Design a protein around this motif. Structure first.
Motif, PDB file in Angstrom:
ATOM      1  N   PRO A   1       0.924  -1.108  -0.120  1.00  0.00           N
ATOM      2  CA  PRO A   1      -0.074  -0.067  -0.016  1.00  0.00           C
ATOM      3  C   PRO A   1       0.991   1.232  -0.035  1.00  0.00           C
ATOM      4  N   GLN A   2       1.128   1.886   1.173  1.00  0.00           N
ATOM      5  CA  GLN A   2       1.841   2.981   1.169  1.00  0.00           C
ATOM      6  C   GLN A   2       3.527   2.862   0.736  1.00  0.00           C
ATOM      7  N   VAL A   3       4.026   3.765   0.522  1.00  0.00           N
ATOM      8  CA  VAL A   3       5.453   3.629  -0.226  1.00  0.00           C
ATOM      9  C   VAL A   3       6.242   2.961   0.885  1.00  0.00           C
ATOM     10  N   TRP A   4       6.231   3.773   2.194  1.00  0.00           N
ATOM     11  CA  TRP A   4       7.381   3.156   3.297  1.00  0.00           C
ATOM     12  C   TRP A   4       7.170   1.636   3.204  1.00  0.00           C
ATOM     13  N   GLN A   5       5.987   1.188   3.071  1.00  0.00           N
ATOM     14  CA  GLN A   5       5.683  -0.330   3.296  1.00  0.00           C
ATOM     15  C   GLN A   5       6.249  -1.141   2.301  1.00  0.00           C
ATOM     16  N   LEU A   6       5.977  -0.380   0.947  1.00  0.00           N
ATOM     17  CA  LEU A   6       6.549  -0.825  -0.286  1.00  0.00           C
ATOM     18  C   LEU A   6       8.100  -1.146   0.065  1.00  0.00           C
ATOM     19  N   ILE A   7       8.752   0.238   0.357  1.00  0.00           N
ATOM     20  CA  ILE A   7      10.354   0.201   0.638  1.00  0.00           C
ATOM     21  C   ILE A   7      10.594  -0.966   1.454  1.00  0.00           C
ATOM     22  N   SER A   8       9.945  -0.972   2.514  1.00  0.00           N
ATOM     23  CA  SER A   8      10.243  -1.833   3.933  1.00  0.00           C
ATOM     24  C   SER A   8      10.549  -3.564   3.336  1.00  0.00           C
ATOM     25  N   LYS A   9       9.379  -3.697   2.387  1.00  0.00           N
ATOM     26  CA  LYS A   9       9.627  -5.005   1.888  1.00  0.00           C
ATOM     27  C   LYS A   9      10.794  -5.296   0.846  1.00  0.00           C
ATOM     28  N   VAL A  10      11.197  -4.059   0.126  1.00  0.00           N
ATOM     29  CA  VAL A  10      12.265  -4.541  -0.866  1.00  0.00           C
ATOM     30  C   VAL A  10      13.430  -4.457  -0.144  1.00  0.00           C
ATOM     31  N   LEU A  11      13.776  -3.684   0.801  1.00  0.00           N
ATOM     32  CA  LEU A  11      15.041  -3.666   1.653  1.00  0.00           C
ATOM     33  C   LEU A  11      15.049  -4.873   2.438  1.00  0.00           C
ATOM     34  N   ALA A  12      14.002  -5.660   2.858  1.00  0.00           N
ATOM     35  CA  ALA A  12      14.041  -6.805   3.406  1.00  0.00           C
ATOM     36  C   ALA A  12      14.615  -7.815   2.921  1.00  0.00           C
ATOM     37  N   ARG A  13      14.346  -7.756   1.290  1.00  0.00           N
ATOM     38  CA  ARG A  13      14.469  -8.598   0.114  1.00  0.00           C
ATOM     39  C   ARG A  13      16.196  -8.487  -0.155  1.00  0.00           C
TER      40      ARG A  13
ATOM     41  N   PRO B  20      24.043  -4.648   0.126  1.00  0.00           N
ATOM     42  CA  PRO B  20      22.989  -5.715  -0.005  1.00  0.00           C
ATOM     43  C   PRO B  20      23.745  -7.155  -0.150  1.00  0.00           C
ATOM     44  N   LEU B  21      22.831  -8.156   0.347  1.00  0.00           N
ATOM     45  CA  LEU B  21      23.336  -9.466   0.199  1.00  0.00           C
ATOM     46  C   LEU B  21      22.974 -10.025  -1.253  1.00  0.00           C
ATOM     47  N   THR B  22      22.336  -9.316  -2.067  1.00  0.00           N
ATOM     48  CA  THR B  22      21.867  -9.700  -3.463  1.00  0.00           C
ATOM     49  C   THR B  22      22.898  -8.876  -4.505  1.00  0.00           C
ATOM     50  N   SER B  23      22.758  -7.620  -4.643  1.00  0.00           N
ATOM     51  CA  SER B  23      23.942  -6.875  -5.538  1.00  0.00           C
ATOM     52  C   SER B  23      23.195  -5.588  -5.511  1.00  0.00           C
ATOM     53  N   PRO B  24      23.890  -4.484  -5.615  1.00  0.00           N
ATOM     54  CA  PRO B  24      23.257  -3.088  -5.770  1.00  0.00           C
ATOM     55  C   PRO B  24      22.451  -2.979  -6.942  1.00  0.00           C
ATOM     56  N   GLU B  25      22.898  -3.740  -7.931  1.00  0.00           N
ATOM     57  CA  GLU B  25      22.241  -3.729  -9.326  1.00  0.00           C
ATOM     58  C   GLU B  25      20.612  -4.072  -9.185  1.00  0.00           C
ATOM     59  N   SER B  26      20.704  -5.675  -8.516  1.00  0.00           N
ATOM     60  CA  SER B  26      19.281  -6.022  -8.378  1.00  0.00           C
ATOM     61  C   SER B  26      18.386  -5.075  -7.379  1.00  0.00           C
ATOM     62  N   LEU B  27      19.116  -4.695  -6.187  1.00  0.00           N
ATOM     63  CA  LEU B  27      18.295  -3.674  -5.447  1.00  0.00           C
ATOM     64  C   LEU B  27      17.763  -2.517  -6.147  1.00  0.00           C
ATOM     65  N   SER B  28      18.742  -1.896  -7.111  1.00  0.00           N
ATOM     66  CA  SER B  28      18.345  -0.617  -7.854  1.00  0.00           C
ATOM     67  C   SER B  28      17.200  -0.879  -8.711  1.00  0.00           C
ATOM     68  N   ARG B  29      17.373  -2.012  -9.502  1.00  0.00           N
ATOM     69  CA  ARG B  29      16.244  -2.627 -10.416  1.00  0.00           C
ATOM     70  C   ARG B  29      15.148  -2.737  -9.980  1.00  0.00           C
ATOM     71  N   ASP B  30      14.843  -3.591  -8.572  1.00  0.00           N
ATOM     72  CA  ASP B  30      13.858  -3.654  -7.908  1.00  0.00           C
ATOM     73  C   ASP B  30      13.223  -2.184  -7.632  1.00  0.00           C
ATOM     74  N   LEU B  31      13.956  -1.206  -7.136  1.00  0.00           N
ATOM     75  CA  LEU B  31      13.387   0.069  -6.784  1.00  0.00           C
ATOM     76  C   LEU B  31      12.964   1.096  -7.793  1.00  0.00           C
ATOM     77  N   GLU B  32      13.526   0.564  -9.339  1.00  0.00           N
ATOM     78  CA  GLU B  32      13.254   1.039 -10.360  1.00  0.00           C
ATOM     79  C   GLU B  32      12.134   0.831 -11.121  1.00  0.00           C
TER      80      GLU B  32
END
Lengths: 46, 53
Positions: A1-13, B20-32
């Motif tokens: 939903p909100q972006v901080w929640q999206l971001i939190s999941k990505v970082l945990a990934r 990151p434990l993955t790679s900075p490229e994988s992290l950026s890709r995900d955030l892009e």
């Protein structure tokens, strides 16, 4: 939903659990500081 | 103000000294990915209008 929640999941990934939270706090402090320093030109670059 | 969430996170990860434990490229890709970047853009627009008032 909100972006901080999206971001939190990505970082945990991509970061260890401890790292993910620390990145997220730093991200929020960075974000907060950028809002405090906002200018009209910044807005116009949106 | 950083327009791109991937750039904001890259700068925050460096500042926090976290790699990151993955790679900075994988992290950026995900955030892009379009959805997450747009959510970031809309949050920012919201917060800017909060500063403006």
């Amino acid at each position: 939903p909100q972006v901080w929640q999206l971001i939190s999941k990505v970082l945990a990934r991509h970061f260890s659990a401890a790292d993910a939270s620390r990145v997220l706090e730093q991200l929020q402090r960075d974000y907060e500081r950028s809002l405090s320093r906002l200018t009209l030109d910044d807005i116009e670059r949106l | 103000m950083q327009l791109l969430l991937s750039e904001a996170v890259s700068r925050a990860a460096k500042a926090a000294g976290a790699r990151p434990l993955t790679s900075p490229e994988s992290l950026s890709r995900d955030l892009e990915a379009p959805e997450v970047q747009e959510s970031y853009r809309q949050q920012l627009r919201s917060d800017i209008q909060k500063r403006l008032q």
